[PDB]
Amino acid sequence: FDYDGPLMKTEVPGPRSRELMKQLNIIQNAEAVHFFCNYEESRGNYLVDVDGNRMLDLYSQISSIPIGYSHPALVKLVQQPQNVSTFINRPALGILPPENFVEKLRESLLSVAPKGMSQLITMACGSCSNENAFKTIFMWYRSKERGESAFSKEELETCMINQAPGCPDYSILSFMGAFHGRTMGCLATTHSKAIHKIDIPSFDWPIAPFPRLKYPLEEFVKENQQEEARCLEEVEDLIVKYRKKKKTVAGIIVEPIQSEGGDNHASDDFFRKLRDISRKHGCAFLVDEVQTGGGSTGKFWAHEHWGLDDPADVMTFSKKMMTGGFFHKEEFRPNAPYRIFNTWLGDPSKNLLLAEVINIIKREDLLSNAAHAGKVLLTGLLDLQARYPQFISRVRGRGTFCSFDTPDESIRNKLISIARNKGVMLGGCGDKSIRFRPTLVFRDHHAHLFLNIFSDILADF
Amino acid sequence: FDYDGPLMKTEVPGPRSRELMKQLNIIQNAEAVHFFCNYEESRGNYLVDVDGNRMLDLYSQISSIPIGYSHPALVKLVQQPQNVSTFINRPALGILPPENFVEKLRESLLSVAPKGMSQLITMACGSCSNENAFKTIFMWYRSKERGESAFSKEELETCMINQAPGCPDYSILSFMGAFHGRTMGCLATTHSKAIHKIDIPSFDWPIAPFPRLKYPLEEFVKENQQEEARCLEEVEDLIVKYRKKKKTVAGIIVEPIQSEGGDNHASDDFFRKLRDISRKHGCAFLVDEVQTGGGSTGKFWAHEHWGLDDPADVMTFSKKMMTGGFFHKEEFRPNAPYRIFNTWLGDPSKNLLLAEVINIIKREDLLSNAAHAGKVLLTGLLDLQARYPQFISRVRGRGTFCSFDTPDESIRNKLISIARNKGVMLGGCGDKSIRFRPTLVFRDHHAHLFLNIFSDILADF
Numbered sequence: 001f002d003y004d005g006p007l008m009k010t011e012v013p014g015p016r017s018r019e020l021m022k023q024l025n026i027i028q029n030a031e032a033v034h035f036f037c038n039y040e041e042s043r044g045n046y047l048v049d050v051d052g053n054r055m056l057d058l059y060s061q062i063s064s065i066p067i068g069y070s071h072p073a074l075v076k077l078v079q080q081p082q083n084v085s086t087f088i089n090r091p092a093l094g095i096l097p098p099e100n101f102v103e104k105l106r107e108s109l110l111s112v113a114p115k116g117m118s119q120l121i122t123m124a125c126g127s128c129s130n131e132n133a134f135k136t137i138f139m140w141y142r143s144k145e146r147g148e149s150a151f152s153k154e155e156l157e158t159c160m161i162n163q164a165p166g167c168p169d170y171s172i173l174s175f176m177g178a179f180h181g182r183t184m185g186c187l188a189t190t191h192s193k194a195i196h197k198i199d200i201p202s203f204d205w206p207i208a209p210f211p212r213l214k215y216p217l218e219e220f221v222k223e224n225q226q227e228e229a230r231c232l233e234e235v236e237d238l239i240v241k242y243r244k245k246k247k248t249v250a251g252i253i254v255e256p257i258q259s260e261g262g263d264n265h266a267s268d269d270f271f272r273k274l275r276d277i278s279r280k281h282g283c284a285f286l287v288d289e290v291q292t293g294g295g296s297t298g299k300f301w302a303h304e305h306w307g308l309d310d311p312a313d314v315m316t317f318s319k320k321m322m323t324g325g326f327f328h329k330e331e332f333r334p335n336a337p338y339r340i341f342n343t344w345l346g347d348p349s350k351n352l353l354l355a356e357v358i359n360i361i362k363r364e365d366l367l368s369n370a371a372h373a374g375k376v377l378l379t380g381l382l383d384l385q386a387r388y389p390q391f392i393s394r395v396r397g398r399g400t401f402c403s404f405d406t407p408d409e410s411i412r413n414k415l416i417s418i419a420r421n422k423g424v425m426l427g428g429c430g431d432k433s434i435r436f437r438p439t440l441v442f443r444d445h446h447a448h449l450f451l452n453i454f455s456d457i458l459a460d461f
Numbered sequence: 462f463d464y465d466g467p468l469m470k471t472e473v474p475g476p477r478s479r480e481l482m483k484q485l486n487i488i489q490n491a492e493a494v495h496f497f498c499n500y501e502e503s504r505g506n507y508l509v510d511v512d513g514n515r516m517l518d519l520y521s522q523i524s525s526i527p528i529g530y531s532h533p534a535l536v537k538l539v540q541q542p543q544n545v546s547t548f549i550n551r552p553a554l555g556i557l558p559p560e561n562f563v564e565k566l567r568e569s570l571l572s573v574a575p576k577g578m579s580q581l582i583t584m585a586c587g588s589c590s591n592e593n594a595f596k597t598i599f600m601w602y603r604s605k606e607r608g609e610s611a612f613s614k615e616e617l618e619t620c621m622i623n624q625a626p627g628c629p630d631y632s633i634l635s636f637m638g639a640f641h642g643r644t645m646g647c648l649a650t651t652h653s654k655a656i657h658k659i660d661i662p663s664f665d666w667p668i669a670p671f672p673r674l675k676y677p678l679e680e681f682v683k684e685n686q687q688e689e690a691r692c693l694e695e696v697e698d699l700i701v702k703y704r705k706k707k708k709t710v711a712g713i714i715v716e717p718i719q720s721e722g723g724d725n726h727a728s729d730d731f732f733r734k735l736r737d738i739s740r741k742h743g744c745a746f747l748v749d750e751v752q753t754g755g756g757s758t759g760k761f762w763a764h765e766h767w768g769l770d771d772p773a774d775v776m777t778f779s780k781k782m783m784t785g786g787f788f789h790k791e792e793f794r795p796n797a798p799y800r801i802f803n804t805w806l807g808d809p810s811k812n813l814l815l816a817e818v819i820n821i822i823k824r825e826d827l828l829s830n831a832a833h834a835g836k837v838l839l840t841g842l843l844d845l846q847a848r849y850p851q852f853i854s855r856v857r858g859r860g861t862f863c864s865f866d867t868p869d870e871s872i873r874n875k876l877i878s879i880a881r882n883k884g885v886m887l888g889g890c891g892d893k894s895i896r897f898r899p900t901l902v903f904r905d906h907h908a909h910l911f912l913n914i915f916s917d918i919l920a921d922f
């Protein structure tokens with residue numbers, strides 16, 4: 001169920017990982033590879049590599065492993081003879097769903113629907129979740145402008161050759177620091193790192209500032225309100241400007257906490273006021289919970305903290321949820337089939353696993369546990385921040401979704417490398433931040449284990 | 462392995478399907494659903510629905526099931542204890558690949574690499590395959606223009622805010638009638654049906670005509686030559702035109718047989734000459750084999766019929782291949798990591814299945830089987846075309862990738878509906894075509910089962 005602590009045999013990557021990396025690098029650029037893994041031996045919060053190292057994994061495959069490695073409840077699912085068909089007969093779900101499709105959706109995604117959103121479409125990853133949410137929003141916007149009218153002859157002819165009016169020049173507004181995926185639509189709304197964006201054609205869509213809070217929060221209450229207000233004003237200005245340019249903003253996308261761009265937080269007030277700005281200008285409000293969703297902030301969806309009855313029009317998800325997709329309000333339901341569509345629309349085998357994951361999260365109270373273990377973690381980070389101000393700053397988080405900055409990227413990288421060799425896997429986000437993304441079976445004692453290991457690391461650093 | 466023929470109990474959709482379709486329609490638009498399926502009872506070439514109907518399936522989940530339903534070799538894989546981890550521990554493949562990653566690629570995709578393409582990146586579907594192929598091509602074209610110069614100050618700045626020169630105004634040339642996926646980059650190269658395109662923002666990229674062959678091929682040799690030469694000229698004119706527009710064509714994307722757009726074929730000669738045009742103007746030649754790939758034309762990749770040692774720069778695949786991805790030439794390898802990247806990059810459980818699928822295709826000589834079973838099907842279609850000229854025209858195919866036209870969409874849909882009630886599932890493409898996409902365990906005797914059912918339908922029509 002759970003190993004007792006990490007156990008290191010070699011530096012990481014070790015000799016066997018380096019050999020496999022060399023082989024992989026023949027067929028593709030393999031420079032991003034950290035090391036090669038023995039998933040069969042990995043269990044709970046512990047990842048085992050091919051050199052026999054066992055590390056405490058606080059990165060969880062870029063936040064996508066919900067209840068740990070080799071979870072016994074999922075092992076038993078794969079072992080049931082009745083589930084074999086689900087793994088080897090993949091349907092074109094849009095046209096030929098399996099008998100249990102709706103019941104399995106009730107056991108899983110529908111049991112955790114966000115407030116106000118009765119509709120659900122499934123997708124296989126976070127990028128096609130967001131792309132199809134964009135499309136759903138453009139279709140809804142044009143519907144407001146035209147319907148209940150038929151498509152015009154001119155629209156139908158021009159859309160086949162990539163021309164207006166069939167292909168409108170509408171826009172989605174996004175934020176600096178955002179990350180929403182890397183397919184060409186998503187990528188236009190992504191503003192994380194130059195290397196993600198460069199040499200790829202884009203869209204002239206509006207880009208607003210996301211707030212940069214000053215820390216510690218109790219000392220900058222007024223400065224941070226002013227910063228949030230200034231950003232809200234620029235959002236509203238942009239929407240007016242792009243309407244004048246004939247590039248109407250049909251929707252606004254935002255993450256509840258910006259991840260890849262550097263764990264940027266903002267107050268619940270900011271998001272509430274942003275939701276209002278959205279409604280006020282007839283913009284669909286798209287909340288991207290691909291990384292924040294699934295419980296690590298202490299609530300199943302992070303937008304739940306805003307306490308709104310109408311938090312959004314569309315919400316996308318993936319990663320911990322195993323499958324992707326988006327919930328949406330009834331009024332965003334496409335008016336005809338084959339507009340939001342692709343071959344597979346997810347995968348029933350992922351829904352099979354997700355239903356059991358959701359069952360475990362509920363039965364074992366793991367939302368509460370993330371709040372609790374996350375408070376232990378953050379408390380400890382604040383203490384190390386106090387004791388090592390020359391290395392640690394802007395300690396921040398919600399639930400286990402925590403982070404801090406280091407003075408620069410070289411130190412960030414050195415700390416992550418040292419930590420890994422000591423048995424703890426950490427992720428970097430932004431320039432010089434270190435981020436935590438523990439699985440949902442991360443408990444108090446894992447937090448205390450990390451803190452005691454990292455404390456020793458700082459003392460020797 | 463397989464039943465002996467279809468066995469119908471009810472109209473399709475029957476009462477239990479119509480009840481499930483009503484439930485699903487509460488949570489999403491379910492108007493595209495044909496019926497609900499019992500995949501556990503489905504076997505080989507036969508799909509069984511929830512009302513107990515057993516249909517000969519000649520659509521195979523939109524040409525994505527490679528060796529039929531519930532194949533016993535695939536059943537065995539899921540039953541093996543050693544494989545449980547591959548199904549429940551999904552890795553972030555770009556950073557933390559499993560120990561067997563490279564070896565399982567040697568057992569599967571690399572054992573069928575196209576000529577001249579040493580590189581391989583995996584993706585989870587056809588859309589992100591084509592999206593990342595576009596990006597790979599744009600990065601390559603820019604590298605041609607700048608290398609050995611590094612990224613300029615201005616580029617690194619402008620790319621973060623969606624502007625040139627960081628974000629170039631390059632284009633991908635695509636063909637009328639094409640289908641390449643529905644994410645916003647793919648969608649700009651798709652020109653299949655207005656319903657796919659309407660109300661979605663697009664890119665101003667060049668669109669060339671795809672040859673429309675006249676049948677019988679034997680009576681139109683000169684005209685078909687001239688038609689292809691006309692299209693080739695128009696492609697080359699578009700590349701020149703768009704270079705002047707300062708919207709340089711970085712690549713050309715084409716299907717070896719256009720599927721969704723209406724099963725449009727062209728000669729092998731046309732494709733060789735198109736490949737040469739691409740090279741001549743320094744465009745990458747991107748061949749989309751998401752639907753034609755995996756054996757049904759008699760060769761593993763449909764471009765293999767062209768007989769070239771250098772058939773393309775990049776080739777994408779998905780559907781029958783279980784996983785997506787693209788092969789490409791070494792000169793197209795990304796210079797830096799994190800440019801072509803996403804969380805999952807495919808799924809090792811699909812590679813596990815695909816290695817076994819490829820083993821079966823080889824051991825059971827299924828490429829040659831598809832050429833033979835396809836010839837028998839096409840011979841029978843030609844006979845029906847001679848006997849029923851009021852309903853059947855332009856019979857055409859390669860391997861089991863066959864199709865014919867009916868007089869109008871209304872008749873097409875009625876014939877599909879009648880055939881389904883008589884035990885055979887067919888697909889449509891374009892305005893008024895009926896298409897065949899049988900699985901690779903479709904045999905000459907299944908061709909005759911279909912032909913005899915369809916002959917009775919046509920006599921009573």
Ligand code: FES
Pocket residue numbers: 124125126127128129183584585586587588589590644
């Ligand atoms: S774009 Fe989501 S799986 Fe391909």
